[PDB]
Design a protein around this ligand. Structure first.
Ligand SMILES: [Zn+2]
Lengths: 212, 211
């Protein structure tokens, strides 16, 4: 089958800047289709038959190419363009897709809004104790999170999860969960979620004390 | 407006069978070719099968030929795919798609239905409220398979919500969801997280009360 190779894997641009992404085919194709996909939804038709914009697609998007190489350009990128773009051909059977190019929209650096939550009384009732930390709406995506118990770092039993870039405000968010047993949780008193982000030379912390 | 709606997704046993359905509306279903396209957990899009307007002609990917069967019922406006001899590579979100009247583009897609192929046990979530502008949360722990849906106040609190992707550990998923509201709204007003885990036939509503 025809292999479609997309480049680059990630584009990152400030609003108003121009970006071009390319789709290279292992054999010559007559046309290239493009789709835009955002987390939690199906790929949306974006460009059909190389250069025709789909319904609702703004005029700042354009498509061009021929033979084994095609491209998608955004003349002035906007916050809403934070998505993964896929190319697809149907000139040779079977129809095939490229691996996608993700577009990250730059914004002014923003500090994570940190929140910490002790185990619920419901979970403690079943012998478990998860301590949750949310580090919300920050930019850039790079962040480090540490867990501290009674003033010392705790490692092992930590599960982290990150969201994709927000389409409205171009920020990222992260969740961190430290899972202990109820017995181990109740042997300590101070619990801290510590973030290190480039928007502050000092760590951003949120704590709770079991005495409270 | 053209609409495509898939159903049937869930947990499939390795070597077993699963049938997906796709309901079409807004167009003469019988006048179009219909497709199944899937997206793997690595986010790769792969065409699966095509069926002609009249249902007489079919095409399959090499991965699924001999195992899957695409069919249509032009009176019920339904597209189907019967899966057999399920493999781990079959684990994907399955979309049904329609083309146009002809460049080979997938002009209309469904919302998708998730199929997970695994011998791991279906387990319901344990939903825990996370009490301390104020931030509240809900922890949906120890379920299988994906997906779960989380809403806050039945969807009314959609702004300021972050529902994080689930993480798998020892065949169980855990996800969290945060909701940030002005301090004037909580705890003076009620905040409830609504969880649904269709694979286990469970719905849980958890009001977030102050500690
Ligand atoms: Zn200890």
């Amino acid at each position: 089958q025809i292999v479609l190779s997309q480049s680059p894997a990630t584009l990152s641009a400030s609003p108003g800047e121009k970006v071009t992404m390319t789709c290279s085919a292992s054999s010559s194709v007559s046309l290239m289709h493009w789709y835009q996909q955002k987390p939690g939804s199906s790929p949306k038709p974006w460009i059909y038959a190389v250069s025709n914009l789909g319904s609702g697609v703004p005029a700042r998007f354009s498509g061009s190419g021929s033979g084994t190489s095609y491209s998608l350009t955004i003349s002035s990128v906007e916050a809403e363009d934070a998505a993964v773009f896929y190319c697809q051909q149907m000139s040779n059977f079977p129809p095939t897709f490229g691996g996608g190019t993700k577009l990250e929209i730059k914004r002014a650096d923003a500090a994570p809004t940190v929140s910490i939550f002790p185990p619920s009384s419901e979970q403690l009732t079943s012998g478990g104790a998860s301590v949750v930390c949310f580090l919300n709406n920050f930019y850039p995506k790079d962040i480090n999170v540490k867990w501290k118990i009674d003033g010392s770092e705790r490692q092992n039993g930590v599960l982290n999860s990150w969201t994709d870039q927000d389409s409205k405000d171009s920020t990222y968010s992260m969740s961190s969960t430290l899972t202990l047993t109820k017995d181990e949780y109740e042997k300590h008193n101070s619990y801290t979620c510590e973030a290190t982000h480039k928007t502050s030379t000092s760590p951003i912390v949120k704590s709770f004390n079991r005495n409270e | 407006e053209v609409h495509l709606v898939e159903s049937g997704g869930g947990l499939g046993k390795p070597g077993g069978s699963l049938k997906l359905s796709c309901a079409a509306s807004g167009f003469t279903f019988s006048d179009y070719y219909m497709y199944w396209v899937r997206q793997t957990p690595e986010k790769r899009l792969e065409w699966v099968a095509t069926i002609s307007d009249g249902g007489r002609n079919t095409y399959y990917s090499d991965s699924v030929k001999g195992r899957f069967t695409i069919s249509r019922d032009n009176a019920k406006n339904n597209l189907y795919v019967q899966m057999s001899s399920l493999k781990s590579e079959d684990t994907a979100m399955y979309y049904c798609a329609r083309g146009d009247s002809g460049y080979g583009d997938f002009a209309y897609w469904g919302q998708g239905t998730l199929v997970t192929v695994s011998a791991a046990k279906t387990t319901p979530p344990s939903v825990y409220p996370l009490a301390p502008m104020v931030t509240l949360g809900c922890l949906v722990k120890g379920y299988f398979p994906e997906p779960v849906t989380v809403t806050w106040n039945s969807g009314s609190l959609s702004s300021g919500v972050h529902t994080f992707p689930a993480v798998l550990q020892s065949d169980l998923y855990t996800l969290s969801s945060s909701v940030t509201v002005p301090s004037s709204t909580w705890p003076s007003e009620t905040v409830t997280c609504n969880v649904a885990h269709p694979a286990s036939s469970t719905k849980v509503d958890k009001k977030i009360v102050p500690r």
